[PDB]
Each structure stands twice: as C-alpha cells, then as structure tokens.
Design a protein around this ligand. Structure first.
Ligand code: FES
Ligand SMILES: [K+]
Ligand SMILES: [K+]
Ligand SMILES: [K+]
Ligand SMILES: [K+]
Ligand SMILES: [Mg+2]
Ligand SMILES: [Mg+2]
Ligand SMILES: [Mg+2]
Ligand SMILES: [Mg+2]
Ligand SMILES: [Mg+2]
Ligand SMILES: [Mg+2]
Ligand SMILES: [Mg+2]
Ligand SMILES: [Mg+2]
Ligand SMILES: [Mg+2]
Ligand SMILES: [Zn+2]
Lengths: 38, 101, 222, 122, 43, 18, 38, 49, 162
RNA sequence: CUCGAUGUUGGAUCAGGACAUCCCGAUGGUGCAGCCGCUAUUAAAGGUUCGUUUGUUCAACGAUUAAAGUCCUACGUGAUCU
C-alpha cells in the first residue's frame, strides 16, 4: 500500500473499491499496485 | 466460457442439453449450450461428453449433467437464465470434485 | 451490423521542414544594461496578442497570468518534441523568448543601497493567450494527452485546446451572459458606480468586469 | 487612484420596460423631486459630503423638494447612491394661500392640501 | 490552535470573512433603490 | 550584516518648472 | 500592503466580496425538468 | 403595555393573541388566493385623511 | 416475480423456476406524461428517508436496491431513493429487510444507538477530535445533499451540516 | 512591545508538550526463500548508555545498547545552582 492523492489502475487486474470511507486500488496479480487514497 | 474454463469439467462425465428450438422458452438453454460447447471448456476434460439433443415434442428444455461420482444435476431452463444455470453448474462442479478427492 | 463512419483525410496537410520546437535561449542575444521596473500589469487582465490560431489546429491556452522562465521553456520543448510524431506533427512557439530582465540583490543584504543586478529573464503571459501551437495529420485526442501534461507544469492555470473546443468555450461563455437570470451584474454596477462601489474597486475593473483578480482568471464569472 | 466617477449617459436613458415597472410618463415628466438622504457621508469622499450639504440633506430621513432640471440632476447624480429620489405628486393641485397651513406630505409622495385627521366616511 | 498571524483583519494573511444571506439581501435592497433613482433622473 | 552597495545614479533632483 | 498582482489570491475588501456574491451567474431553471417530459 | 397585559390582564391578552392569529390566517388565505377572494373581515384597513 | 427452487432427492438435484404473483402499478397515474414512476405520480421533491411505503417498492427482500433498468427510475431519482434506503436501514425503519444470514450464524449483542438522517456508515467515520476555528469549523454532515431540492415548507433551508 | 534593565553561551536540576517514530507493538509492498534489510500505513502508553580531548552546542574517537530519535517550551529552567 502506497498513499496516493490520484489513484490510477496500473494493470487490467486492478480494481477500485471504496472501503472505510476512502478509495483503494487492489490488485491480486501484482500486489505492488495496491494504493490508498491520501 | 472463461469463468467456466477456469474451474474445468474434471468431475463431469456427461452433459446433455435437450430443447425444442421451435419453442419460445429455449434461449437460456441454447445459451448454456454455447458456453459449455466452447473449445476452452471442452478442452478442460476430453472424457466428458457434451451432447445436444434436439427435439420437436413440445417438451420443456432440460439440462442433464452426470458426474463421475454418479450424481445427477437436472436444470430445467424454461424459467432459468443462462447465468443461473452456469452458476449452479459451477457450484456442483466445485462440490463433487472435493468429494471424489 | 455495427455502423462504420467516414474518417477525415489529412492528405491536404503539409508538414514544415523543422517540425520540432526550436531551442529557446536563456537570455537575449545582446545582454541588457538598463534595469527595468517591475511592471506587474504585463500579466494582469486579458491578453490582446496571440489569442487566435495561425498555422496549426491545437494549442495550450493560458487561463491565467504568469512569467515563463527558461526552465519552463525546456520543460515544454523536451516534453513536446519527445511525445510528438515528427512525420505527422509539427509545433511552433506562440510566446517570445525571455526578454524581461529580473534583478536580484545578493543574499543577506539589507534594504536599500540601490537596485539589484540583472539575474535572469522571463516572458510575461496574460490570460487567454496561446503558448504553443501544434498541427498536422492528427486528431485532438492524440496530442491532448501530452499537451495537458505540459499545461499542468506551467506556472499559471493552462489547458490544451483545439479550434473547436476553444470556439465552443467562447460561445458557451456568451450563452451564459445572455441567459443569466441574475438582474445584477458586476459590469452594470461598476460602470454606473452604484452604491459608490468604485471606492473599493480598481480603474481596471471597468474593463475586467469582475472576471479578473490580480493575475487570476475566473471563467465562471459572467 | 480613487477619483470622481463619470457616469455614462446611457445609465440615465429609460427603456420602455422601465416605464412599466416604475409608472412614469416620458412625455409628462414630473416637475419636482422628493429627495431623502438614507446613507451617511462618513467614509465617502469630501466632494460627496459637500454636495449633500448643498442639497440641504444634512439630516437623514428628512424629505427635501428640488427642481427636476439638468443642473440639479447633475448634483443628484454625484450622490445618487446616498439618497432616495421620488416624484412629488399633486393629486389636488398646488397648495393655495387658503390651504398653505393644512398640507401633509404622505409616504406615497403625494402632497395633500387637506389634512383632517378623520376617518373616511366612504 | 487556529491562530491568525498578526492582527486579524489586516496584512497578507487575514481572518476570512464570509457573506451571509442577510448581507446579500441588504445589498440587493439598496441596489433596487439606486436603480429606481436612475429612472427618475432620466426625464 | 553584509556590507551593501551604492546607487550609481546621481543628479536628477530638479524641481518642477511650473 | 501587497501589490495589485500577487502570487497568492489576495483577500478582497468586504464590500467587494459582497458585490461578487450578489452578481453570481444564475442559470435559467425550467418549470418542469426536461427529462420528465416526452 | 403588551407585557403588562400579559401579566395582569390574561383574558385581554388571549383575545389579542386570538386576533393576531385570526389576522395571520387571513393573510395565508389571501396569499394562496389569486385575487378572487374579497379582503378578510379583520384585514380591512380604516383609512384616514 | 420468479422463484428458483433447488430440490435434492437422493443422488439427483433438480433446479427449477416458477412464476409467482406479480404486483401491478395502480391504475390512472395523475401524470401519464411522466417519464419514470416518480414523476408519473408527481412525487418528485416530495419524499424523504422515512417514506418507507415509497422506498420499500424499489428494494429487494433482503434490503438491497433494485436495478434502474428494472424499476424504470431515472438516474437522478434512482440515486435519491438509493441514499434514502441506506438512511432508512440505518434508522431501523426496515426491520423485515435484513441481510441474509447463513445457517448457524447468530450476531453477537451490539450496543444500540438510535440514529436518523445518517449519511455515512457508522464504522467508516472518525471522531472530530479537533473542531477547528469558527471560520474553518469541521462540520458533522446530516442528511444527504441529493435531497437538497426537496420541497421546503419552512423559511429556513435544510441544514445539511451541523 | 521592552533601554526610570524583558540578565546575555554551554552544563547541573526538574522536566511539560508535538510526532515528521530512534527502540518496543500492529500492518501493506518488495528486485521479501531464510537470516538480515529497504519502503509505506498505524502507534507518543514505556524507553532512548558510559567515557577520552574541547568552554563548547556540535564533531571525532573508545566501549556498549532493543535504541543511543527529530523538535517546541523567552534557542524550557541563574528570585534553584554553575
Ligand atoms: S423522469 Fe420524472 S422524476 Fe424521473
Ligand atoms: K500549474
Ligand atoms: K495579519
Ligand atoms: K532594553
Ligand atoms: K575539558
Ligand atoms: Mg494577533
Ligand atoms: Mg526629475
Ligand atoms: Mg523634488
Ligand atoms: Mg498598493
Ligand atoms: Mg519599570
Ligand atoms: Mg518529558
Ligand atoms: Mg505518525
Ligand atoms: Mg534559554
Ligand atoms: Mg527564573
Ligand atoms: Zn494491477
């Protein structure tokens, strides 16, 4: 998880989900793509 | 076919799709045939027969699945969607496979 | 039967011999000796030069006033020359090279003792001016990507535009002024000095009409 | 710099829609204004202070009558933001020597020549 | 916390003032009076 | 406290001619 | 004081703030939302 | 006087409250109408001259 | 509506579908020209989170929203009802539309806090530990901005931030 | 602001607070096999050494430590000391 002001999907397997009041990027194929809205 | 190809047809022994194409309630069952008759799904297990039985009796469409364990799944598609039948079919594959192993 | 549509043809378009952006020098050819006043009104208000397309079809529009130093020109040049197709694209400068001298006093010194020495040069830009103009055998979606990337790095509010989006932008502003349901507008009040309001306004507000504040431009103001 | 303000002449050209809204007659202009100061001269330039005095408007909320003529209007325009201008209406005509002492200026701008302080029998 | 640098209502950094609904209505009320003044000064 | 420079512009102090 | 052109957005005189507030664009509102009609 | 009436003449004050309430309801009826309705009985103003 | 029944007898499962009774829209809508159920009955701007008789017609048996393509609502009204349903659940106004619980699951006892006009999900909101100055106060949202155009019978407009 | 005086470095004594965390806790990512690391989220309850030279704050060096944190407090503290 890296904090990001602008969330961007980095591959086709990234999906945007809003959890605990903020947006996240989750990716099972490449966990390094995981992002947290700052 | 992509979602059903991931799971495979390993525990399945036969799949028989019966419908009367001149009737008005066969579209879901014909869509089920399109998905399971795909080369991707069929290539997951070459010992599983996929049979299409066309009829003109006026009977309601049926999908009869025989698993290797000996259990049967009968999905009557007159009032089922192709997605529902494929979801149920996937669920029983996920179960019968565990029982055998 | 998915319906296909015709495609525009750019065969009639010509490409210059040097499509890339030329190099901009830090300082003018001959260095200036006479030191100049700050003259902040060169970035204040609407632009009256380089507001229309000349050769190309696409550009970066300035939505505010500012000064372009040499560091900005290098960012524009390299970013554009790298992202463009020399065969089917071409770009030109719509702003002159830095000519306005900016003095600085040596660090640590007190107020007074005359004026500082010329440090660097800048190019003043007003709101509504085209900074770079592109064209060639290309659509807007092709250049808009890296043009907006450049526009974001400018010291003022900027945005990539085309002959169409610029025209629509201007006609949309005129439409808002006509159908405005508010019976009170900044212009009417200011020009008639209603409420004695000119005691808190500027002489320039008679022409800017509340759309401009310092170097900032407010497009939502009618 | 803050200076006196030149008002464009177009500001004082009434449109047909204005005549409907306010009810004036362009062909029969009113003769006299009713002018009342409703704003302070504090925090206003001295030239505005000076004109308020000339018009006899030093005391707020005190109606003064003035001639509706270009010269007077020129002064009124300088301080238009400090005052309220209404037309003097004469529903029973001008006061005469007999009724000089029985007049009252109503809030509607009508100067009546009889003031009985009685209810209307009608 | 939440201090305003220097004096509140002067200088570079100031306490922000906001326009209330009644401040707007007050201004519009005087705009209507002046608009009518314009009319009666036109004839 | 660094020592500063000086202005090199002299004269120019005439009053208005009226 | 600050100059007429500043790097930050200069604070306005309160009377000017009110002027801006009172002269904001008001869009024409239709009686019936156009999406609610054939 | 209104404060004095509330303390020492509560029946007169209730009548005044009723009168105000009646005039308030007449206002609403008038505002809702399109001019067809005649003026309310308590809304009529006595004119002086 | 359509029900799906799974009947397992011996080694053979049978999946079927039956058509049950379907409710019909009340006859003679007051605004036949209306383009969605809301404006066909002149209900636009005239319903709130507590109008469960209205809201309950557009939700699934377990409390979930129904698709806009099925109900026929417009995007604007569909979003208003969606937010209103979330507030109705959180206020406890839909006690017979609770989530489906798998066999053997009994929720633990949780503290009961009565609430209404709840915009956010309780677990996703942090305490306001620093309120900030009067001129930059952190506010507690109440209600939904989607309902800002609802008919207001008072002279004060709806306060959406407390 | 204070010159009809608001005592000026470092140290001693006692420490209050911030977290932009040095150690200890909980997590995501890794060019994370493991052992060690790097990076980010969360965490301020508790802890954060002794010495040689130098007035020193620092710095270098010796020996340790789970770690020898960054800062604010009139560069905290002289009607408590030096
Ligand atoms: S179309 Fe009328 S409210 Fe949706
Ligand atoms: K920028
Ligand atoms: K200040
Ligand atoms: K002193
Ligand atoms: K020593
Ligand atoms: Mg202060
Ligand atoms: Mg001279
Ligand atoms: Mg002189
Ligand atoms: Mg100045
Ligand atoms: Mg003293
Ligand atoms: Mg401590
Ligand atoms: Mg932290
Ligand atoms: Mg100290
Ligand atoms: Mg002391
Ligand atoms: Zn990814």
């Amino acid at each position: 998880f890296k904090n990001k002001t602008v969330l961007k999907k980095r591959c086709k397997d990234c999906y945007l989900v809003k959890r605990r009041g903020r947006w996240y990027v989750y990716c099972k194929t490449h966990p390094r793509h995981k992002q947290r809205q700052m | 076919a992509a979602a059903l190809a991931r799971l495979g047809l390993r525990p399945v022994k036969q799949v028989r799709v019966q419908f009367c194409p001149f009737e008005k309630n066969v579209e879901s069952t014909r869509t089920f045939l399109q998905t399971v008759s795909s080369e991707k799904v069929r290539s997951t297990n070459l010992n599983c027969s996929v049979i299409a039985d066309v009829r003109h009796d006026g009977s309601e469409p049926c999908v009869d699945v025989l698993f290797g364990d000996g259990h049967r799944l009968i999905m009557r598609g007159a009032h089922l969607t192709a997605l529902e039948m494929l979801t149920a079919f996937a669920s029983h594959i996920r179960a019968r496979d565990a029982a055998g192993s | 039967v998915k319906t296909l549509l015709p495609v525009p043809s750019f065969e009639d378009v010509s490409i210059p011999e040097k499509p890339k952006l030329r190099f901009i020098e830090r300082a003018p050819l001959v260095p200036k000796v006479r030191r100049e006043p700050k003259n902040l009104s060169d970035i204040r208000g609407p632009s009256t030069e380089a507001t229309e397309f000349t050769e190309g079809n696409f550009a970066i529009l300035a939505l505010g006033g500012g000064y372009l130093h040499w560091g900005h020109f290098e960012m524009m040049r390299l970013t554009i020359n790298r992202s463009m197709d020399p065969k089917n694209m071409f770009a030109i400068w719509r702003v002159p090279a830095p000519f306005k001298p900016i003095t600085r006093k040596s660090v640590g010194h007190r107020m007074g003792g005359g004026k500082g020495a010329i440090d660097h040069y800048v190019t003043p830009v007003k709101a509504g001016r085209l900074v770079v103009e592109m064209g060639g055998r290309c659509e807007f979606e092709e250049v808009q990507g890296f043009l907006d990337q450049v526009a974001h790095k400018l010291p003022f509010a900027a945005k990539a535009v085309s002959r169409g989006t610029l025209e629509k932008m201007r006609k949309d502003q005129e439409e808002r002024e006509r159908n405005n349901q508010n019976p009170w507008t900044f212009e009417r009040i200011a020009t008639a000095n209603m409420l004695g309001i000119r005691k808190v306004l500027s002489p320039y507000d008679l022409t800017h009409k509340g759309k401009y504040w310092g170097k900032f431009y407010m497009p939502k103001r009618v | 710099k803050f200076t006196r303000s030149r008002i464009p002449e177009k500001v004082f050209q009434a449109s047909p829609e204005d005549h409907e809204k306010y009810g004036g007659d362009p062909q029969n202009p009113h003769k006299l204004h009713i002018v009342t100061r409703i704003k302070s001269t504090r925090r206003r330039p001295y030239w505005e202070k000076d004109i308020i005095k000339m018009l006899g408007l030093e005391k707020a909320h005190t109606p003064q009558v003035h001639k509706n003529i270009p010269s007077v209007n020129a002064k009124l325009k300088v301080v238009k933001h400090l005052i309220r201008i209404k037309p003097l209406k004469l529903p029973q005509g001008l006061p005469a020597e007999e009724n000089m002492s029985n007049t009252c200026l109503k809030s509607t701008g009508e100067l009546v020549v009889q003031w009985h302080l009685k209810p209307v029998e009608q | 916390r939440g201090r305003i640098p220097g004096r509140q209502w002067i200088g570079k950094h100031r306490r922000p003032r906001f326009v209330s609904l009644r401040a707007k209505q007050n201004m519009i009320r005087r705009l209507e009076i002046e608009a009518e003044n314009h009319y009666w000064l036109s004839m | 406290k660094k020592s500063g420079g000086s202005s090199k512009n002299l004269g120019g102090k005439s009053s208005g001619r009226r | 004081g600050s100059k007429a052109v500043t790097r930050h957005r200069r604070v306005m005189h309160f009377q000017r703030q009110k002027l801006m507030a009172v002269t904001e664009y008001i869009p024409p509102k239709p009686a019936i939302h156009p999406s609610c009609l054939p | 006087v209104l404060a004095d009436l509330a303390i020492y003449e509560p029946k007169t004050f209730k009548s005044l409250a009723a009168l105000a309430s009646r005039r308030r309801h007449e206002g609403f009826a008038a505002a809702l109408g399109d001019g067809k309705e005649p003026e309310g009985i308590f809304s009529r103003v006595v004119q002086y001259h | 509506f359509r029900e799906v029944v799974e009947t397992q007898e011996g080694k053979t499962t049978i999946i079927e579908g039956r058509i049950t009774a379907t409710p019909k829209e009340s006859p003679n809508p007051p605004n036949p020209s209306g383009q969605c159920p809301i404006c066909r009955w002149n209900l636009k701007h005239k319903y709130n989170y507590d109008d469960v008789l209205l809201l309950s017609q557009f939700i699934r048996p377990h409390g979930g929203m129904l698709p806009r393509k099925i109900t026929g609502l417009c995007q604007e009204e569909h979003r208003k009802i969606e937010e209103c349903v979330k507030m109705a659940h959180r206020a406890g106004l839909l006690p017979n539309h609770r989530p489906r619980l798998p066999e053997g699951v009994v929720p633990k006892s949780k503290p009961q806090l009565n609430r209404y006009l709840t915009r956010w999900a309780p677990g996703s909101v942090k305490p306001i530990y620093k309120k900030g100055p009067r001129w930059n106060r952190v506010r507690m949202p109440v209600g939904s901005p989607l309902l800002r155009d609802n008919v207001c019978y008072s002279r004060t407009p709806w306060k959406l931030y407390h």
